[PDB]
Design a binder for this molecule. Structure first.
Ligand SMILES: COC(=O)c1cc(C)cc(O)c1C(=O)c1c(O)cccc1O
Ligand SMILES: COC(=O)c1cc(C)cc(O)c1C(=O)c1c(O)cccc1O
Lengths: 141, 141
C-alpha cells in the first residue's frame, strides 16, 4: 500500500467531500472502478457503481438540506490500505427530518489517492424503497 | 498504545474466543471493565457491562448450536489501539436457523492483552427481545 500519510490525506478528503454534500465533491475521491456495497450482505442490496452514484447523488443531495456529518470514530489500517469511519448524519427533507448512521469500510487504491472500494452498514431504506420508486417514475415517462 | 504485534495477537485471540463459542473462552479476552454498546446510537440500546455479558453468554451459547464465525474484514489501527472486524455468523436454534452480521469496533487496553471497549452494529433482536422475555419467565416462577 501507499504511505500512511498519503492514505490519510485521501481519507480526510473523502470525509470532506461527503460533508460538503455536493455530487462532484464527494465523487472526486472515488477511483474510476470504485463501488459501494450495502451491508449486511443478507439484505441483498445491489452494489452501486461510480456511474450509478453520479446519477443518484444529485437528486439525493438536493432533497436533503442542512446536511450535517458527525464523525464518531475513524480507524485507519495503513499497512493494509483500509479504513473504517463511523458517522452520524442528519438532514431536512420535504417529508420531515432525516437521520442515519453509517459504519463505512474503505479500501484505498494502490497509489493511495483514491477510494477504490466501499462497503457500508447503514439504514438503507432510501436505497431499498426510494430508488425503485424513482426508477419506475422514470420508466412511466 | 501497546505494540502493534501484541494488539494483533489479542485481536486474533478475541476472534478465537468468539469462534470457540464458550462463555469463559469468549469473555477471557475482555478486560475486567470492558463494555459493549449496540449501534446505531439512534436505537438507544443501553450499554452492557462485562457482568451483563457474563449473565447473557451461557444461555445464548447453549441455544445456538453449530455456531460458525466467518471473518470478512479486519481493519487494525495500531497507532490508535483500535480495530474493526466485520463478521458473519450462523447457527441452529430450536426455533429455526440463525444468521447475523456484525461491524464490531474494538479498543485494546494499554497493556495490549485485552479488549476494553466494544461498539457494534448488528441485528440486536436476540439481546433486546429474547433475554428480557426469559427474565420475565423466571420472575413468574
Ligand atoms: C448521496 O449520498 C451519498 O453521497 C452517500 C455517501 C456515503 C458516504 C454513504 C452513502 O450511503 C451515501 C448515499 O448514497 C446515501 C444513500 O444512498 C441513501 C441515503 C443517504 C445516503 O447518504
Ligand atoms: C453471546 O455473546 C456473543 O458471543 C457475542 C459476541 C460478539 C463479538 C458480539 C455480540 O453481540 C455477542 C452477543 O452478545 C450476541 C447477542 O447478544 C445476540 C446474538 C448474537 C450474539 O453474538
Amino acid at each position: 500500500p501507499a504511505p500512511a500519510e498519503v492514505q490519510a490525506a485521501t481519507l480526510e478528503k473523502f470525509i470532506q467531500g461527503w460533508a460538503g454534500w455536493t455530487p462532484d465533491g464527494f465523487l472526486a475521491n472515488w477511483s474510476e472502478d470504485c463501488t459501494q456495497k450495502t451491508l449486511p450482505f443478507s439484505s441483498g442490496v445491489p452494489l452501486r457503481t461510480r456511474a450509478d452514484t453520479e446519477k443518484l447523488a444529485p437528486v439525493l443531495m438536493s432533497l436533503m438540506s442542512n446536511f450535517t456529518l458527525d464523525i464518531h470514530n475513524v480507524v485507519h489500517d495503513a499497512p493494509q490500505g483500509k479504513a473504517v469511519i463511523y458517522a452520524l448524519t442528519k438532514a431536512d427533507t420535504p417529508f420531515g427530518p432525516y437521520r442515519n448512521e453509517h459504519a463505512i469500510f474503505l479500501w484505498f487504491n494502490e497509489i493511495g489517492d483514491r477510494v477504490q472500494k466501499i462497503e457500508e452498514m447503514f439504514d438503507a431504506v432510501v436505497m431499498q424503497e426510494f430508488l425503485p420508486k424513482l426508477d419506475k417514475y422514470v420508466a412511466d415517462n
